[PDB]
Design a protein around this ligand. Structure first.
Ligand code: GDP
Ligand code: GDP
Lengths: 432, 432
């Protein structure tokens, strides 16, 4: 079961559901076998939680999970968005925990910039909207990618030319003001922003590097590279549950557009499938458990915001969406995480079919929410088990009902399971 | 030289420079060998020009170039943006020219909608800006992709639920008004838009289909599919000459995010490289020829807007950019087009190296325009020729100086040339 040494020159870990499946943990385990670990999409809005040898907790945002290994180079691709202030704060927090970052992190010169501006703008949007509620989710991710699409946003390369940075930054400052009256843009406030990032440019300079060239050059030199997926594909701007999705492309296609590598060079793709689904926030949720069964999962899995402490909605594993997701990415294998959370459940259901409001079986996963929010899920109950498995390291040591579980999944999904998570620890992973 | 039968289950044609390289022509020639031809990115803003057997001129916008073959199904992927009014106008124009479209064109339900709104908004932007000039380029492409990223835009699936379409459309109508004072949004004007697209929904209905499912299902059934690239990768939102680029991703990664297919399933990728570069509009142009040499190319190649008649800037083939582009996409081969345009030139230069403002050779293509607009190109003059080759069908029949040309290119680029265009006609293509 040498799964660690079976991976190709260029491999990648992708989330196959919604929210946090625990990709980081896997990336941390597989990282020492790779020369480079790169984040291709998203911003610091995410948050991978990993633990070292001593059991020390680490919560990453932008930095790839491979940062805990000396011989590994972390890279933030061009597909990403960087909130420079928060970035350095993240760096400082790692440097104080004995983890050096100097010369071990590359920042794509082609990656766009997320200013505090986008953050306040993001907030202004909801303030007037139907009123999305309670949560300091001032993640200016949406607006930043918009500036990018609009082509009026700034990129990392701009910090090398502070001369023009001024008249390049005021342009989107002026824009935002024209839109919201809750923004005045003082000419004095602009002066600061320039002098602020002028200082930031000094510190960030050694990190900047031609991400596209470096990566491609690396491949020519046979350097192994593991791509860390930002979020899940069900959250994808195109394939996810629109409009309830992210403005980024968490799918496999995104690793090409976010890193600048050829689709032909991408080898194995491990899809992280949590034993049960968890959707954070409003949106369609077929397998959603509003009853005690959901409460049991939530507490056991600790499905609560790392900052907000808000409970993530839970439910049974959705195979319909998973199968659909498998096709889109073309996963070589899968990492079935948080299996230890299902312990204690007498019955564990699986969403297999999708019926219409009347009773017609759908051949594929619904695009529009109109049809999706009105579906009749067809479950498949399986024998559960009452046994703490957070200690099982070998596959054969698992309960018969638990083994039957992964097997039924890999059967319906079509893709085999090579990793089974039974604990948050770096050590808590079973190889199949 | 059975290049037509060498292509994989899923192949694709991509532009490797800027502007129009003549991808459509190739797609039209290769189309009859494929079961499906699909457009993965962009909107009607493009415009592929192809000719049938009788020599009839056809100018496509959204519809893939494979539309001229009966046993071929054209597909407009989820990555695209559809301006429904213009679409039907394009359909009507094809139906009158004896080309039926009923049941031969699929429209992705997940593809976003480009309303006249985005068109007027796009215009409002430039009106107040530094003043981009003269040109009815009211292509609301930029703003539409923005609505998408913002997640407040509408998609094709919404037309199936006109009930909510109303309150879903007014949302971005209200938005635009808040931004520009040159927009008032009459409640009466909204009423129309709803009743307009309510009628459009009736006509478009038979075209709509789950693009993602269909395509993937097709692959499972071994149906060949050829992807038609929208524009070129040097125009890519991430990899192109930002900010002078399009809001879409014309690169290979884009065919994944635009169609919903696995990166592992994409086979051959033919990169269309015109014999000389042509950049339409302002932006960095290293190999730009402002002298007579440029005028000769422009007239011979007919480098003028199909609608605006404006002359496209011209120059020598840029190998630096090409090589850089080759890596990003991973082209299996290349299609060297418009070779017949180089006839008459005593000398033909090739951009090989890139020197700094002082004299330092760059290892890679520049990201920021600051450095790019200030480079010293290092050419490589080759023997030209004075011979009308618009009649040469075999490779050996070409002039020695012309053959030496393609060979030096495929040598420096690393990827072989399999197609050489010597005329706009369907028949005017040489196989190497
Ligand atoms: N109990 C348990 N927790 C796990 C397991 N795998 C991962 N986790 C935890 O689940 C959370 C996963 O979300 P997070 O890592 O923030 O998101 P990611 O970006 O998808 O990695 C982390 O806090 C992990 O330490 C597992 O097998 N069992
Ligand atoms: N002279 C000449 N014209 C060509 C050749 N191949 C294509 N063209 C024409 O060049 C133009 C290329 O732009 P177009 O095809 O609209 O753009 P595309 O979107 O890249 O296909 C078209 O009008 C073609 O008919 C060639 O080998 N020689």
């Amino acid at each position: 079961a040498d799964r660690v040494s079976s991976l190709s020159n260029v491999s990648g870990v992708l989330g196959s559901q919604w929210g946090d499946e625990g990709k980081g943990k896997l990336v941390d385990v597989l990282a020492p076998r790779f020369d480079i670990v790169a984040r291709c999409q998203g911003g610091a809005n995410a948050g991978h939680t990993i633990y070292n040898s001593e059991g020390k907790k680490f919560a990453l945002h932008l930095v790839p999970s491979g940062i805990l290994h000396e011989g590994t180079l972390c890279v933030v691709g061009n597909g990403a968005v960087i909130h420079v202030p928060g970035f350095f704060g993240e760096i400082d927090g790692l440097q104080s925990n004995g983890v050096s970052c100097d010369g071990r992190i590359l920042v794509s010169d082609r990656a766009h910039l997320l200013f505090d501006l986008h953050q306040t703008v993001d907030g202004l949007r909801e303030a007037e909207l139907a009123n999305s509620f309670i949560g300091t989710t001032k993640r200016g991710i949406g607006p930043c990618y918009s500036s990018k699409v609009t082509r009026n946003g700034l990129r990392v390369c701009d910090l090398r030319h502070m001369d023009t940075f001024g008249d390049k930054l005021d342009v989107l400052f002026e824009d935002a003001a024209a839109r919201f009256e809750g923004f005045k843009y003082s000419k004095g406030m602009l002066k600061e922003e320039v002098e602020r990032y002028k200082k930031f440019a000094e510190r960030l300079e050694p990190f900047i590097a031609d991400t596209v060239h470096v990566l491609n050059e690396s491949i020519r030199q046979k350097k192994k590279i593991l791509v860390e997926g930002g979020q899940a594909t069900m959250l994808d701007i195109d394939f996810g549950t629109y409009p309830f999705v992210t403005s980024s492309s968490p799918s496999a296609g995104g690793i090409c557009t976010g890193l600048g590598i050829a689709p032909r060079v991408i080898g194995d793709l491990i899809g992280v499938v949590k034993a049960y689904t968890t959707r954070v926030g409003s949106g369609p949720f077929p397998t959603e458990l509003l009853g005690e069964e959901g409460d049991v999962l939530r507490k056991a899995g600790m499905e609560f915001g790392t900052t907000t402490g808000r409970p993530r909605r839970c439910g049974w594993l959705d195979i319909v969406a998973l199968k659909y997701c498998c096709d889109i990415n073309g996963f070589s294998s899968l990492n079935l995480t948080k299996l230890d959370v299902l312990s204690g459940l007498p019955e564990i259901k699986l969403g297999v079919s999708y019926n219409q409001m009347d009773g017609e079986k759908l051949q594929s996963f619904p695009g529009d929410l109109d049809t999706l929010e009105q579906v009749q899920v067809n479950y498949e109950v399986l024998p559960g088990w009452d046994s703490d498995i957070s200690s099982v390291r070998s596959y054969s040591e698992l309960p018969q009902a638990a083994r039957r579980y992964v097997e039924r999944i890999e059967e319906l999904a079509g893709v085999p399971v090579h990793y089974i998570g039974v604990g948050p620890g770096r050590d808590a992973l079973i190889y199949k």
